[PDB]
Amino acid sequence: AGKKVLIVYAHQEPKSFNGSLKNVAVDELSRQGCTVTVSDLYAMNFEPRATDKDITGTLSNPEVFNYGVETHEAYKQRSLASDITDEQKKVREADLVIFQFPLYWFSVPAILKGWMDRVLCQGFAFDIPGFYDSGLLQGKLALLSVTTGGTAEMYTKTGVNGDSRYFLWPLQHGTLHFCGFKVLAPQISFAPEIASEEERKGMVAAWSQRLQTIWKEEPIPCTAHWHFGQ
Amino acid sequence: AGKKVLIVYAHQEPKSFNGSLKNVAVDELSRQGCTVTVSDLYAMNFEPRATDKDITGTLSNPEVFNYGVETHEAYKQRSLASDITDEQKKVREADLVIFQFPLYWFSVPAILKGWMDRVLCQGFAFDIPGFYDSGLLQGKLALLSVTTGGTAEMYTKTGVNGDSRYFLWPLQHGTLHFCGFKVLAPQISFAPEIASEEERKGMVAAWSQRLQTIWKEEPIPCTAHWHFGQ
Ligand SMILES: Cc1cc2nc3c(=O)[nH]c(=O)nc-3n(C[C@H](O)[C@H](O)[C@H](O)COP(=O)(O)OP(=O)(O)OC[C@H]3O[C@@H](n4cnc5c(N)ncnc54)[C@H](O)[C@@H]3O)c2cc1C
Ligand SMILES: Cc1cc2nc3c(=O)[nH]c(=O)nc-3n(C[C@H](O)[C@H](O)[C@H](O)COP(=O)(O)OP(=O)(O)OC[C@H]3O[C@@H](n4cnc5c(N)ncnc54)[C@H](O)[C@@H]3O)c2cc1C
Numbered sequence: 089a090g091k092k093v094l095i096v097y098a099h100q101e102p103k104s105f106n107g108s109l110k111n112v113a114v115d116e117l118s119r120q121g122c123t124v125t126v127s128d129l130y131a132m133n134f135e136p137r138a139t140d141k142d143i144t145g146t147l148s149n150p151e152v153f154n155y156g157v158e159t160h161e162a163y164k165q166r167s168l169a170s171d172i173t174d175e176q177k178k179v180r181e182a183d184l185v186i187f188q189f190p191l192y193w194f195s196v197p198a199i200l201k202g203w204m205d206r207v208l209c210q211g212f213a214f215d216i217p218g219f220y221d222s223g224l225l226q227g228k229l230a231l232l233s234v235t236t237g238g239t240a241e242m243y244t245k246t247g248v249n250g251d252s253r254y255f256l257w258p259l260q261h262g263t264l265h266f267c268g269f270k271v272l273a274p275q276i277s278f279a280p281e282i283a284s285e286e287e288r289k290g291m292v293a294a295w296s297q298r299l300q301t302i303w304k305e306e307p308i309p310c311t312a313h314w315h316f317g318q
Numbered sequence: 319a320g321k322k323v324l325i326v327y328a329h330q331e332p333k334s335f336n337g338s339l340k341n342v343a344v345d346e347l348s349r350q351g352c353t354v355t356v357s358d359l360y361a362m363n364f365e366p367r368a369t370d371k372d373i374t375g376t377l378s379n380p381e382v383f384n385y386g387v388e389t390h391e392a393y394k395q396r397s398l399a400s401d402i403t404d405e406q407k408k409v410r411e412a413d414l415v416i417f418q419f420p421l422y423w424f425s426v427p428a429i430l431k432g433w434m435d436r437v438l439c440q441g442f443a444f445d446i447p448g449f450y451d452s453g454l455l456q457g458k459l460a461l462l463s464v465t466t467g468g469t470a471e472m473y474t475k476t477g478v479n480g481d482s483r484y485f486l487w488p489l490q491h492g493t494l495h496f497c498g499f500k501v502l503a504p505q506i507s508f509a510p511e512i513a514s515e516e517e518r519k520g521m522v523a524a525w526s527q528r529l530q531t532i533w534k535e536e537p538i539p540c541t542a543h544w545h546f547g548q
């Protein structure tokens with residue numbers, strides 16, 4: 089205490105189940121006295137494509153464009169597009185980053201994928217070496233709050249979709265752990281469109297209630313064993 | 319008569335290793351007499367965001383925007399935006415879809431994620447009950463040709479990145495199998511950047527040689543067992 093939270097939110101419709109989860113998060117964290125910022129990606133028309141427009145200085149190799157090389161250089165030089173550096177400041181200052189989104193093809197919506205591809209650049213979020221437990225965002229927490237079309241039963245080892253933890257791997261491990269975050273347990277709200285009124289109201293209050301005690305949680309062990317079992 | 323091939327290609331640089339891989343595919347499949355189309359997403363400045371611009375004329379429910387429902391309705395009512403319907407016509411006609419991209423955060427670059435989100439819509443690629451084995455694209459083949467920054471060893475079950483198959487799950491199972499594709503074994507070119515100009519030539523040649531007998535291949539068993547178990 090005090091703490092800063094950044095909610096990276098990816099939904100088009102403010103009256104949605106995602107919008108309600110993001111709003112109870114802002115309400116609950118604000119009530120506790122935390123500092124809260126929301127990056128509402130669709131509302132910002134956030135640029136998801138990794139292009140040469142993300143660099144505004146002299147290119148290190150202006151004959152063969154390599155996005156990774158040019159963004160890492162631009163980061164050190166401070167010539168990245170300012171939409172990227174606005175996001176990096178929010179992440180740099182945050183103690184906790186919550187990503188709020190509907191599952192799209194077992195992953196994040198593209199607009200949010202583009203935030204991860206463009207904001208978590210080398211130099212800022214990781215270095216080579218300086219990744220996983222040595223990633224540059226070490227000491228920060230991150231949490232996925234995901235909604236699905238598919239039911240909890242569908243997302244079991246024997247269900248048609250495989251276990252829910254399987255689709256978490258690229259995001260929790262390959263992205264967040266890689267940058268050094270400690271990952272808190274995912275919040276997964278299954279199948280709200282199918283749920284009843286009471287069940288949807290229960291899922292919102294469960295999230296709200298879990299946030300009351302978020303600062304007391306331990307991270308998951310972000311390993312293959314946690315994601316896949318043995 | 320002959321097969322049709324669609325290459326969805328997601329790299330900013332013509333001279334890159336991705337670009338060479340794409341150009342080998344075009345040349346080899348063209349040599350064989352195949353009908354070949356390339357979707358060069360970055361050259362198309364392809365839109366990755368799922369927004370209400372994806373639907374033309376007036377919305378099914380203009381008070382609460384639900385992207386899934388509205389694009390399903392627009393597909394059935396021939397009211398989708400023409401960047402999406404252009405891609406769908408290329409997919410509908412294809413016998414094989416090859417995706418050629420660098421791995422970004424254990425997944426596809428956001429421009430390519432936005433093509434999957436937007437082009438593979440309900441009523442086109444899947445519905446109730448056409449999903450998994452009965453998905454609407456049954457009978458077509460799909461193939462991921464991925465390049466990585468990480469080495470083959472980093473991508474083992476007990477290596478730092480875990481098994482390559484772990485990241486393949488959301489793309490191969492959650493997306494391509496879900497839509498009914500039969501999925502061919504992925505082509506993975508590990509760590510081209512850490513050379514040599516010989517292993518590089520050799521990875522390119524292997525890809526060109528594999529495309530020679532691409533039509534004789536059997537699809538993988540696209541199962542939790544293939545990705546995760548023994
Ligand atoms: C391109 C695409 C890909 C997808 N891929 C997958 C996938 O791979 N796997 C999968 O399982 N699903 C997938 N889906 C389905 C998607 O994940 C779900 O449709 C989404 O998670 C539901 O969240 P929502 O906020 O949009 O729900 P909504 O439709 O907005 O909400 C459902 C109901 O909850 C109501 N609601 C809003 N706020 C409250 C509140 N406070 N209290 C009670 N009710 C409230 C809404 O009014 C609505 O009636 C995909 C969808 C799309 C469009
Ligand atoms: C946002 C971001 C996220 C990333 N996430 C990951 C991740 O999760 N995991 C991971 O492993 N990696 C990741 N990477 C690294 C990325 O996957 C690799 O940089 C990429 O796959 C390399 O492919 P390329 O085509 O750009 O290589 P290039 O740099 O373009 O080429 C490699 C070498 O081969 C040369 N070459 C070109 N054509 C030929 C040819 N015809 N014959 C011989 N040589 C040729 C090139 O000139 C170059 O010297 C990430 C990168 C970025 C930018």
Ligand SMILES: COc1cc2c(C)cc(=O)n(C)c2c(OC)c1OC
Pocket residue numbers: 193194236237238239242249386440492493496
């Ligand atoms: C592609 O879109 C969707 C995909 C899925 C997938 C892959 C699995 C699943 O269980 N469900 C339930 C989905 C869903 O729910 C409704 C979608 O909604 C549009």
Ligand SMILES: COc1cc2c(C)cc(=O)n(C)c2c(OC)c1OC
Pocket residue numbers: 156210216262263266423424466467468469472479
């Ligand atoms: C985000 O960018 C990158 C990410 C990775 C990840 C997640 C794993 C990995 O093994 N490597 C090798 C990466 C890499 O390679 C150099 C990147 O490029 C800068």
Ligand SMILES: [Zn+2]
Pocket residue numbers: 260261262265266309310311
């Ligand atoms: Zn991990």
Ligand SMILES: [Zn+2]
Pocket residue numbers: 490491492495496539540541542
């Ligand atoms: Zn499968």
